[PDB]
Design a protein around this ligand. Structure first.
Ligand SMILES: [Zn+2]
Length: 27
């Protein structure tokens, strides 16, 4: 699993989803 927005790889999908939420921000 990897954050498509950057390329940061994660082992767990749940962690990646949390990381995706951070990209769903404006600032
Ligand atoms: Zn990311």
């Amino acid at each position: 699993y990897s954050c498509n927005v950057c390329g940061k790889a994660f082992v767990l999908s749940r962690h990646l989803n949390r990381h995706l939420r951070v990209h769903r921000r404006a600032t």
